[PDB]
Design a binder for this molecule. Structure first.
Ligand SMILES: [Mg+2]
Ligand SMILES: [Zn+2]
Ligand SMILES: [Zn+2]
Lengths: 49, 50, 50, 1338, 90, 99, 73
């Protein structure tokens, strides 16, 4: 994971039950950006026509 | 008590009873029953106690 | 960076996160005193001591 | 269109009428041209074309030819979906018996032929012959003849002899039968067969024959001669990728049947030996039975795998069958799910919806609105515009969404608040935003939960969403009228911090001109939020006919309370925000607003409360640190002291002075005391602080410690959890349920060592494994309770009855745990509530008791009100609105068309994963009052209990009971009725053992029949040598004395025999066995003297389930089956005998009281029906019979509310009475009277009730009956609809029973209209059904 | 008799174990399928096979009485066989 | 995941299930009970027939929606037609009685 | 929008009956072609029908009388 600077306090209901409030500097610096690779296939078959 | 409630007096009757219990309805036979009992355990092929 | 809710700690008696937060603050404090000595171009003798 | 679904057996003519052709070949399709074969199971000339509007040869390919039969192949040219509807048939070579009507346990074929199943099967599998109308040659009809017997009987009998074998023999038996003549013979026999078993059998069989005659069927239809074939598209042969094919298992079964039928037909033409044809017929029978119902009598049939093949019966029954799964649990269009986030800025009626999820859900609406404004010329153009996501599309979407609710639903829908309607607000992102105040309704948190969203399409659906399901209409819990929209945890913390004073803060002692100045001072930093000041407050009150009169005064309050006053609406007082405002104060405040002002003010107020709480909770900057968990300074000292005490106990035990069992408890108690001491020290060190000051002196105040602030406000957590944080973890358990003696003396601020952690792991996993069981068991109860109560609906306004339950507060020994207000609020009075002075009517009648009336009743201090109950409603097939009460979710009297049964089931069931399977000392002050009390002056003038139902109640000054203590029999009370008492004033005492024997007058006593060594024994005290004659039981005493009954009749000094004082009968008090007669033989005694001294529930969800299932307790208490005088007779007959010879009535009633029992009635005593004889758990069925219906409902509601009250759950009693109403809805008839019912018969109570009421209006008399009590399972089993019953019962049993009876279904329940796909007759669809009934009567 | 004894407990506990059933089972040799037939016959009045020792009653008495009568017949039976191949061999 | 209309199953012509299939949401008994606890009888009817497996009542609904006419002609579910055919393919004769 | 429908329920007297009358009126207004008896403040026909019901301008009898008049003409 990543080392995040964290403060424990309510802050306006945006962490009400278990919600988390994050800064835009965490999103700018790409701290939790991940790379996902997927493969797609195209099969050409011989039909009756 | 087990002996007094024993329905057997000889080995052959015991083997016949075991034969009926395992595969009931088949004609019991001395050789067949002895073979079945001797193969159920005591046979290296059909029973392994590792 | 992130704001967490304190009300989740009392009911869920997992107070290892508070101790982890305190110790992480301590470790990052040690790290910030070296960044300063390495940015004020100070001699090894002083970095070796701290 | 259709108004009923009729079911019956099918004749071969009907089966041929359905079919469009006969299947003759087991072929399916060609293996190269994958086209349908000529006469196979996928033919096209029988089941229809495989392409729309085309033949198979190809000549006719254009619709212009629709409706002609091509002569190159005979394939009618039409739609291919007709292939989904057409049936075929197979002509069987031999008749075959239907497995359902042959192997259903009552075995309709056997029941109709009066023939045991084994004989039928033998004749069926060619094992023996049978005689079919043997005639006049010594033959008996239905006589079994073995093959050799048939051969030898055929000799010397040139007559046909009418013998046959196989299913054709059974068909001949059924066909030759005559039902009317059988009915005539059965009536003639019942004329002169008055024998219990015999006449019972005759009545059963004549009933069955009459039912079959009425049904319109013919018995010979139970034997199959033609076999229907399902349409191909329901058993398809779909091609897959790669050339593979997928097929339904029915094709295999059909191919089996066809192959064996063809082989049999071919083999009949070769004149094969009869062994071969018999074996072929047996195989054909097996194949047909495997088709209809696979593995019902044989073992099974398997395909390529070893799995059994799925048969026709397997496609309807099961938990996956159509009669279940698809028909109420299907997939739906215009829906989607996602993850939920908070969105704290929203209003209660609005939800945040992702723009991308909405561009898909509302696609047709967008196309329509684009084409209507000219943006898109056609629909394909619109489809490309939305696909490109043009700019105008977003504006059109914002227009479409404007006022169009969406239903949001979270996984386990446990009650109806799990689906609610909201107005969307289009947002960015991919997560749904949910208003915080709604979370409690959904039981939802924001750690990964997901919600589903549906969109209503029709105008009616949108209106129902807006008017019935909108979140702002549902702010009260349907289980109890309490608000369900209360602020939860962070709002509570913020509002608690705001309204909270402290000793010395900035701006103390100031005087403000109002709330505005208070807010102006705080935001400018000139005053603290906790600053005791004086503020000029203006408050309005409706102290008139709705006027809102204003009052201005100078209140003493903090700054925060004055600021918070700005959001409170007008009509409320100022004392609501003039406190610390914890968790429950806020709920009380919302309830007050709702009850005083209404619904819209409450919604606005709740939103304002949420906003203010969030703002000021952010402002406080509250946090949690490690120094906030303060450990007591004396913890180690307490632990050392407890360790020393346990060591001393252990070393004493090692010296053998205390047994191990006792020392275990000693150590347990020592550690419990230590844990309590530590917790008290911690909580006292944590909950207070010292602050200095206004002048400079110490002062104590409530602490501002963050953990204590969270716990005290109710925001989150409790003292139990703080105990494990700062105190000691406490005492654990063991897998065996035992308590480990040594506790975990460490807390989490410290660490647990490895051993303590290993101990804790067991508890954790145990809890994790339990929760799941609780969930699975609460679902079972809810399903069963909605099955029983689903079709209960409010169908009337006022039945006009004058009866009801008598509500009084419930008191368990000491204090009152539920006042009268909670039990009587919202109900309708059955009788006038006379003022306690008996002067005039306080509430006339038929008055819904809302809050004002309940306040008036509290003012008059009346504690007994008779209210109308559902269980005692005169309405037929429904309930009236006045007998129900009020809605509890809307706050007003209920409306016609309300599914009160589903609401009751859900309200009882939803709070069930929170239920865990677990002398008198007048405390207060009042005038003791006694009930059912008989007594006589004792030696010191003290009273003596001479009643078995004696009751003592500490009636208070106003006359309202505050305690109720059952008075043990044979005990003396120090005080008396009217004698004021005090604390600890033990009003009376009694032997904790040995039931005493008292007399009535002072006189000598003769031991008549009390012979020593014969009926009694000289057990004179061995040490003190004090006479101790002991009565000997039959076996204990001599055989001669065994018949003799020991008697101690009182005798006067005159030598006469004293007769029971006040009675002609002599004062004999026969003593039973073991009677401790310490009194000397023939000794004079005092009044009511001790003539002798005879020697001495589950909980949780399983308790509730077995309370609704009417289970009889294992040691059922015995009661007085009749009023009269008790006695006895032929004893030792395994069970002692009793009798209650009615004072004047006959039939003294005899009973087999098991001897091991301990009676509570002296052999000579009078009793009343419903009086305890033995003692123990009471049986609900006994209570209903001896005592009325009102006395069994009161028992169940009180017995089932104890489980819930103990756990803190709160649900109204309305919901338990509607379930009870459904339990006792069958009545047993006692006297046929002038009605048309037999005596020993069970009928619907609502049916017998109206049959005799109509009869009574005529010149006849009614039929008496006795009510019956059933559990929620049998009661359900009695549904009069084979479609509703086939849903939740055994489908095979339901459909065979309905078919032979020729039953007909008329859709009028909620479960049968859901399956058929039409409006339910409950809610908005209750008016449709009523007009349908009007037109039908027309 | 033996079957009645087996029923005695079934009802007394409301459930039984495979072993107890198989044992109380009439010595009447059964060709597997027959044992299969009786198990359901007992299941007719309702019972829990449960290879191990242990959820409500919904059985009509009519089913119950019929299952009882057929259960009695099983004991009086001699060579009842519900298997075509076996019947063929005989 | 969101769906408006998509592909349908072969035998039970019901919305397919999943995201790949772009399926719909499962609406089961406990949700039916919730709608019955309200009076929402039209919502239930449209969720059982027009939105799931009323084959010719679901295309008419689409055409009506794209015409600005929010009204449905429900009809009969195809889970009931299949049930009738399966019961009738036994020996039983179950028929809809004329009004 | 219209957060609550308390007043319309008060006028009609039954909640299920309010849902039916409002739907009938809204269908008259959207597809039949009719003019609102109240100003249409950018509201959908559902809300317009509800707030006509709120003011006593529409109920089952009124709808029925008007429809019978139309049938006559
Ligand atoms: Mg969760
Ligand atoms: Zn052709
Ligand atoms: Zn009533």
């Amino acid at each position: 994971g990543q080392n995040m600077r964290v403060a424990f306090m309510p802050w306006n209901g945006y962490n009400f039950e278990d919600s988390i409030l994050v800064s835009e500097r965490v999103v700018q610096e790409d701290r939790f950006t991940t790379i996902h690779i997927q493969e797609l296939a195209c099969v050409s078959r011989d039909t009756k026509l | 008590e087990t002996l007094r409630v024993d329905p057997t007096n000889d080995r052959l009757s015991a083997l016949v009873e075991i034969y009926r219990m395992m595969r009931p309805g088949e004609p019991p036979t001395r050789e067949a029953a002895e073979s079945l009992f001797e193969n159920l355990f005591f046979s290296e092929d059909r029973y392994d106690l590792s | 960076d992130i704001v967490l809710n304190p009300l989740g700690v009392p009911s869920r008696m997992n107070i290892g996160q508070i101790l982890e937060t305190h110790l992480g603050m301590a470790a990052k404090g040690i790290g910030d005193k070296i960044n300063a000595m390495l940015k004020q171009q100070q001699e090894v003798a002083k970095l070796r001591e701290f | 269109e259709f108004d009923a679904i009729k079911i019956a057996l099918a004749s071969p003519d009907m089966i041929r009428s359905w079919s469009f052709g006969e299947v003759k070949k087991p072929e399916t399709i060609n293996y190269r041209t994958f086209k349908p074969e000529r006469d196979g199971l996928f033919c096209a000339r029988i089941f229809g074309p495989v392409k729309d509007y085309e033949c198979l040869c190809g000549k006719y390919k254009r619709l212009k030819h629709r409706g002609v039969i091509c002569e190159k192949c005979g394939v009618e040219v039409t739609q291919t979906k007709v292939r989904r509807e057409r049936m075929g048939h197979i002509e069987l070579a031999s008749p075959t018996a239907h497995i359902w009507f042959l192997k259903s346990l009552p075995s309709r074929i056997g029941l109709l032929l009066d023939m045991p199943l084994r004989d039928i099967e033998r004749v069926l599998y060619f094992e023996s012959y049978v005689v079919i109308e043997g005639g006049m040659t010594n033959l008996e009809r239905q006589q079994i003849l073995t093959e050799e017997q048939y051969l030898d009987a055929l000799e010397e009998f040139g007559d046909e002899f009418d013998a046959k074998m196989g299913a054709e023999a059974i068909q001949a038996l059924l066909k030759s039968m005559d039902l009317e003549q059988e009915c005539e013979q059965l009536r003639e026999e019942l004329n002169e067969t008055n024998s219990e078993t015999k006449r019972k059998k005759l009545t059963k069989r004549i009933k069955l024959l009459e039912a079959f005659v009425q049904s319109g069927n013919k018995p010979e239809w139970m034997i199959l001669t033609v076999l229907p074939v399902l349409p191909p598209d329901l058993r398809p042969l779909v091609p897959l990728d790669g050339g593979r094919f997928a097929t339904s298992d029915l094709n295999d079964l059909y191919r089996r049947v066809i192959n064996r039928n063809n082989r049999l037909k071919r083999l009949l033409d070769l004149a094969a030996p009869d062994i071969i044809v018999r074996n072929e017929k047996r195989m054909l029978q097996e194949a047909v039975d495997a088709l209809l119902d696979n593995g019902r009598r044989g073992r099974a049939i398997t395909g390529s795998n070893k799995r059994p093949l799925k048969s026709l019966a397997d496609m309807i029954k099961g938990k996956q069958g159509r009669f279940r799964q698809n028909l109420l649990g299907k997939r739906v269009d215009y829906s989607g799910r996602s993850v939920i986030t908070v969105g704290p800025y929203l209003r209660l009626h609005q939800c945040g919806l992702p723009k991308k999820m909405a561009l898909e859900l509302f696609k047709p609406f967008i196309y329509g609105k684009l084409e209507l404004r000219g943006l898109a010329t056609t629909i394909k153009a619109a489809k490309k515009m939305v696909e490109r996501e043009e700019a105008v599309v977003w504006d059109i979407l914002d227009e479409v969404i404007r006022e169009h609710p969406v239903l949001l639903n979270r996984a386990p829908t446990l009650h109806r608040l799990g689906i609610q309607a909201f107005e969307p607000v289009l947002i960015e992102g991919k997560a749904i935003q949910l208003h915080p105040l709604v979370c409690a309704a959904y039981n939802a948190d924001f750690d990964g939960d997901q919600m589903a969203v549906h969109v209503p399409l029709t105008l009616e659906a949108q209106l129902e969403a807006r008017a019935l399901m909108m979140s702002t209409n549902n702010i009260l819990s349907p289980a109890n009228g309490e608000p369900i929209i209360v602020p939860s945890q962070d709002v509570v913390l913020g509002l608690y911090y705001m309204t909270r004073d402290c000793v010395n803060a900035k701006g103390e002692g100031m005087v403000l001109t109002g709330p505005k100045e208070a807010e102006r001072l705080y935001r400018s930093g000139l005053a603290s939020l906790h600053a005791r000041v004086k503020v000029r407050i203006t408050e309005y009150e409706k102290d008139a006919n709705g006027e809102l009169v204003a009052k201005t005064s100078l209140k003493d309050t903090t700054v925060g309370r004055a600021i918070l006053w700005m959001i409170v609406p007008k009509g409320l007082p100022y004392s609501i925000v003039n406190q610390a405002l914890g968790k429950k104060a806020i709920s009380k405040m919302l309830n007050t607003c709702y009850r005083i002002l209404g619904l819209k003010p409450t919604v606005i107020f709740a939103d304002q409360i949420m906003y203010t709480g969030f703002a000021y909770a952010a402002r406080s900057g509250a946090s949690v640190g490690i120094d906030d968990m303060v450990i007591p300074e004396k913890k180690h000292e307490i632990i050392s002291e407890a360790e020393a005490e346990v060591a001393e106990i252990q070393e004493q035990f090692q010296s053998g002075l205390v047994t191990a069992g006792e020392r275990y408890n000693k150590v347990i108690d020592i550690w419990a005391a230590a844990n309590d001491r530590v917790s008290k020290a911690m909580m006292d060190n944590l909950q207070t602080e010292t602050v200095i000051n206004r002048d400079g002196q110490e002062e104590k105040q409530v602490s501002f410690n963050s953990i204590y602030m969270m716990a005290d406000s109710g925001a989150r957590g409790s003292a139990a959890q703080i105990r494990q944080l700062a105190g000691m973890r406490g005492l654990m358990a063991k897998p065996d349920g035992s308590i480990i003696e040594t506790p975990i003396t460490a807390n989490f601020r410290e660490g647990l060592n490895v051993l303590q952690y290993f101990i804790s792991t067991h508890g954790a996993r145990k809890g994790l494994a339990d929760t799941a069981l609780k969930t699975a068991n609460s679902g079972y109860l809810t399903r069963r309770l909605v099955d029983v109560a689903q079709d209960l609906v409010v169908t009337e306004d006022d039945c006009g009855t004058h009866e009801g339950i008598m509500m009084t507060p419930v008191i368990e020994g000491g204090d009152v745990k539920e006042p009268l207000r909670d039990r009587v609020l919202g109900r309708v009075t059955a009788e006038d509530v006379l003022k306690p002075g008996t002067a005039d009517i306080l509430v006339p009648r038929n008055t819904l008791l809302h809050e004002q009336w309940c306040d008036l009743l509290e003012e008059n201090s009346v504690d007994a009100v008779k209210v109308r109950s559902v269980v005692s409603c005169d309405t037929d097939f429904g309930v009236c609105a006045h007998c129900y009460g009020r809605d509890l979710a809307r706050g007003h009297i209920i409306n016609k068309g309300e599914a009160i049964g589903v609401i009751a089931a859900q309200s009882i069931g939803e709070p069930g994963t929170q239920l865990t399977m677990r002398s008198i000392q007048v405390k207060n002050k009042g005038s003791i009052k006694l009930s059912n009390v008989k007594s006589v002056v004792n030696s010191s003038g003290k009273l003596v209990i001479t009643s078995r139902n004696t009751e003592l109640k500490l009636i208070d000054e106003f006359g309202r009971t505050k305690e109720s203590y059952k008075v043990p029999y044979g005990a003396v009370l120090a005080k008396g009725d009217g004698e004021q008492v005090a604390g600890g004033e033990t009003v009376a005492n009694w032997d904790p053992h040995t039931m005493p024997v008292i007399t009535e007058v002072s006189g000598f006593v003769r031991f008549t029949d009390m012979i020593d060594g014969q009926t009694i024994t000289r057990q004179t005290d061995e040490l003190t040598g004090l006479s101790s004659l002991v009565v000997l039981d039959s076996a204990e005493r001599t055989a001669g004395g065994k018949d003799l009954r020991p008697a101690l009749k009182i005798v006067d000094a005159q030598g006469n025999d004293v007769l029971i004082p006040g009675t002609d009968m002599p004062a004999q008090y026969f003593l039973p066995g073991k009677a401790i007669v310490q009194l000397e033989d023939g000794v004079q005694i005092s009044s009511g003297d001790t003539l002798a001294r005879i020697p001495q529930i589950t909980g949780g969800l399983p308790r509730v389930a077995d309370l609704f299932e009417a289970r009889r307790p294992k040691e059922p208490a015995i009661l007085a089956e009749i009023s009269g005088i008790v006695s006895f007779g032929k004893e030792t007959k395994g069970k002692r005998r009793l009798v209650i010879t009615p004072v004047d009535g006959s039939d003294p009633y005899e009973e087999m009281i098991p001897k091991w029992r301990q009676l509570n009635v002296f052999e000579g005593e009078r009793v009343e029906r419903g009086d305890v004889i033995s003692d123990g758990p009471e049986a609900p069925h006994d209570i209903l019979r001896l005592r009325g219906v009102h006395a069994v409902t009161r028992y169940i509601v009180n017995e089932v509310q104890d489980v819930y009250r103990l756990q803190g759950v709160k649900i109204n009693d309305k919901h338990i009475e509607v379930i009870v109403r459904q339990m006792l809805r069958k009545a047993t008839i006692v006297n046929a009277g002038s009605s048309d019912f037999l005596e020993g018969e069970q009928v619907e109570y609502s049916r017998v009730k109206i049959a005799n009421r109509e009869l009574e209006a005529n010149g006849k008399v009614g039929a008496t009956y006795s009510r019956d009590l059933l559990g929620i399972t049998k009661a359900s089993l009695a549904t009069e609809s084979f479609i509703s019953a086939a849903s939740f019962q055994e489908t095979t049993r339901v459909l065979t029973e309905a078919a032979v009876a020729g039953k007909r279904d008329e859709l009028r329940g909620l479960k049968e209209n859901v399956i058929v796909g039409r409006l339910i007759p409950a809610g908005t669809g209750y008016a449709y059904h009523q007009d349908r009934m009007r037109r039908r009567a027309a | 008799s033996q079957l009645k004894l087996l029923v005695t407990r079934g009802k007394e506990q409301g459930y039984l174990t495979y072993a107890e059933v198989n044992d109380h089972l009439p010595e009447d040799i059964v060709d597997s399928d027959q044992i299969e037939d009786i198990i359901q016959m007992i299941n007719d009045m309702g019972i829990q096979v449960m290879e191990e020792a242990p959820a409500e009653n919904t059985a009509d008495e009519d089913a119950a009485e019929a299952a009882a009568q057929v259960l009695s017949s099983v004991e009086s039976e001699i060579g009842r066989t519900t298997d075509p191949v076996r019947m063929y061999m005989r | 995941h969101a769906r408006s209309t998509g592909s349908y199953s072969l035998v039970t012509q019901q919305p397919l299930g999943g995201k790949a299939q772009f399926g719909g949401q499962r609406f089961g008994e406990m949700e039916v009970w919730a709608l019955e606890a309200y009076g929402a009888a039209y919502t239930l009817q449209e969720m059982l027939t027009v939105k799931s497996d009323d084959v010719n009542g679901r295309t008419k609904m689409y055409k009506n929606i794209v015409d600005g006419n929010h009204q449905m002609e429900p009809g009969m579910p195809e889970s009931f037609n299949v049930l009738l055919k399966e019961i009738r393919s036994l020996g039983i004769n179950i028929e809809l009685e004329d009004e | 929008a219209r957060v609550t429908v308390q007043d319309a329920v008060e006028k009609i007297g039954n909640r299920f009956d309010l849902v039916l009358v409002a739907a009938r009126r809204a269908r008259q207004m959207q597809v039949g072609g009719k003019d609102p008896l109240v100003p249409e403040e950018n509201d959908k026909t559902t809300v317009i029908a509800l707030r006509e019901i709120e003011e006593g301008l529409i109920n089952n009898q009124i709808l029925d009388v008007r429809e019978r008049q139309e049938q006559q003409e």
